[PDB]
Write an enzyme that holds these catalytic residues in place. Structure first.
Site, mmCIF file in Angstrom:
data_model
loop_
_atom_site.group_PDB
_atom_site.id
_atom_site.type_symbol
_atom_site.label_atom_id
_atom_site.label_comp_id
_atom_site.label_asym_id
_atom_site.label_seq_id
_atom_site.Cartn_x
_atom_site.Cartn_y
_atom_site.Cartn_z
ATOM 1 N N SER A 45 0.791 -1.225 0.000
ATOM 2 C CA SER A 45 0.000 0.000 0.000
ATOM 3 C C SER A 45 0.824 1.276 0.000
ATOM 4 C CB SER A 45 -0.965 0.018 1.195
ATOM 5 O OG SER A 45 -1.939 -1.009 1.069
ATOM 6 N N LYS A 48 0.154 3.586 -2.831
ATOM 7 C CA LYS A 48 -1.031 4.439 -2.897
ATOM 8 C C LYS A 48 -0.666 5.916 -2.909
ATOM 9 C CE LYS A 48 -3.814 0.847 -0.760
ATOM 10 N NZ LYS A 48 -4.661 0.423 0.383
ATOM 11 N N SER A 105 -5.986 3.059 4.154
ATOM 12 C CA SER A 105 -5.479 2.026 3.260
ATOM 13 C C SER A 105 -6.612 1.193 2.671
ATOM 14 C CB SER A 105 -4.450 1.129 3.963
ATOM 15 O OG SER A 105 -3.446 0.755 3.027
ATOM 16 N N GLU A 141 -5.433 -3.935 -6.840
ATOM 17 C CA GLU A 141 -5.695 -4.564 -5.553
ATOM 18 C C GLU A 141 -6.661 -5.728 -5.731
ATOM 19 O OE1 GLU A 141 -3.573 -1.668 -3.065
ATOM 20 O OE2 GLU A 141 -4.164 -3.787 -2.953
ATOM 21 N N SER A 212 1.392 -3.343 3.891
ATOM 22 C CA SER A 212 1.376 -4.708 4.384
ATOM 23 C C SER A 212 1.036 -5.673 3.253
ATOM 24 C CB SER A 212 0.354 -4.874 5.511
ATOM 25 O OG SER A 212 -0.939 -4.487 5.063
HETATM 26 B B1 LIG Z 1 -1.867 -2.127 2.053
HETATM 27 O O1 LIG Z 1 -0.542 -2.771 1.934
HETATM 28 O O2 LIG Z 1 -1.986 -1.507 3.415
HETATM 29 C C1 LIG Z 1 -3.065 -3.167 1.737
HETATM 30 N N1 LIG Z 1 -2.960 -4.400 2.544
HETATM 31 C C2 LIG Z 1 -3.511 -5.578 2.282
HETATM 32 O O3 LIG Z 1 -4.296 -5.625 1.378
HETATM 33 C C3 LIG Z 1 -3.189 -6.623 3.320
HETATM 34 N N2 LIG Z 1 -3.481 -6.512 4.581
HETATM 35 O O4 LIG Z 1 -4.141 -5.370 4.968
HETATM 36 C C4 LIG Z 1 -4.729 -5.462 6.316
HETATM 37 C C5 LIG Z 1 -5.983 -6.327 6.152
HETATM 38 C C6 LIG Z 1 -5.216 -4.044 6.585
HETATM 39 C C7 LIG Z 1 -3.678 -5.900 7.298
HETATM 40 O O5 LIG Z 1 -4.030 -6.833 8.066
HETATM 41 O O6 LIG Z 1 -2.498 -5.430 7.236
HETATM 42 C C8 LIG Z 1 -2.719 -7.945 2.857
HETATM 43 C C9 LIG Z 1 -2.675 -8.252 1.520
HETATM 44 S S1 LIG Z 1 -1.926 -9.775 1.348
HETATM 45 C C10 LIG Z 1 -1.669 -9.820 3.043
HETATM 46 N N3 LIG Z 1 -1.089 -10.854 3.677
HETATM 47 N N4 LIG Z 1 -2.215 -8.851 3.733
#
Ligand SMILES: *[B]([O])([O])[C][N]C(=O)/C(=N\OC([C])([C])C([O])=O)C1=[C]SC([N])=N1
Length: 263
Positions: A45, A48, A105, A141, A212
């Site tokens: 993210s 973004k 996010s 995404e 993440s």
């Molecule tokens: B961005 O990188 O913040 C978007 N993140 C994701 O889509 C992932 N997790 O986001 C949440 C649910 C907010 C989190 O728990 O950190 C994600 C995509 S693949 C993965 N293992 N986690």
């Protein structure tokens, strides 16, 4: 050509079990500190920021663009949509989408920014327009977060992202009003208190965007306004060998602390 700071970051990385990338720019003197600064990392993210900035750039020639409604449909929801799901069968403006993408996010929000730019390649094209030859966005995404080791898709380097964040938030890659809007959004982020901010003195003001993904990928990119000195730009990227690894925001905090202690 290995500084005490770089040696400490290597020690932190070794204890972490993963791979750490750091790039600092001190805008007082333009000096840089890097650790694996030219290695590629999955952005997740943190990408973004580039998409929102690209839309801000478009808005410079369209005064009403940020007020333009975008339809949100049930099929548009993806894995994490805390703001967009409230607007299903309704609309969100591009400003609302930008805010949701950056401060919460929201992944559906990011997908609408990407679509507004003509696909992932429109985000990449903006990066090139502002001097970043390294950034690449290849997917939407949620697949842009697969973060597979060795995969070049949806990656950049710490050095490139630090440079770009500086140009976007403190430089002139954007118009003045747009730069201010981006800074306002970053400063109001809700997701960053455990990452870079946690490693710096509390009196400092920070604007950041976390990331993440799979492989326990844990990222943060920040603009920092320390007490008593010129702003800093700091990128901390971290990714791990196992696909199901857990988040390690503490490692980003630890990296930031080492950087700060080196000032
Ligand atoms: B961005 O990188 O913040 C978007 N993140 C994701 O889509 C992932 N997790 O986001 C949440 C649910 C907010 C989190 O728990 O950190 C994600 C995509 S693949 C993965 N293992 N986690």
């Amino acid at each position: 050509q290995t500084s005490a700071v770089q040696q400490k970051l290597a020690a932190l990385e070794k204890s972490s079990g993963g791979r750490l990338g750091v790039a600092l720019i001190d805008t007082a003197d333009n000096t840089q500190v890097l650790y694996r600064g030219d290695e590629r990392f999955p952005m997740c993210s943190t990408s973004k920021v580039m998409a929102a900035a690209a839309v801000l750039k478009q808005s410079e020639t369209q005064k009403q663009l940020l007020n333009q409604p975008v339809e949100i449909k049930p099929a548009d929801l993806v894995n994490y949509n805390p703001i967009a799901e409230k607007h299903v069968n309704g609309t969100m403006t591009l400003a609302e989408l930008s805010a949701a993408a950056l401060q919460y996010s929201d992944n559906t929000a990011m997908n609408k920014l990407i679509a507004q730019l003509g696909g992932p390649g429109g985000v990449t094209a903006f990066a090139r327009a502002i001097g970043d030859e390294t950034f690449r966005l290849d997917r939407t995404e949620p697949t842009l977060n697969t973060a597979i080791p060795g995969d070049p898709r949806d990656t950049t380097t710490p050095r490139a992202m630090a440079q770009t964040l500086r140009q976007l938030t403190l430089g002139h890659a954007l118009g003045e009003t747009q730069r201010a809007q981006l800074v306002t959004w970053l400063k109001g982020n809700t997701t960053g208190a455990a990452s870079i901010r946690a490693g710096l003195p509390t009196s400092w003001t920070v604007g950041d965007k976390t990331g993440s993904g799979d492989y326990g990928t844990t990222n943060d990119i920040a603009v920092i306004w320390p007490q008593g000195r010129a702003p800093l730009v700091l990128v901390t990227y971290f990714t791990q060998p196992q696909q199901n690894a857990e988040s390690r925001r503490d490692v980003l905090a630890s990296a930031a602390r080492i950087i700060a202690e080196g000032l």
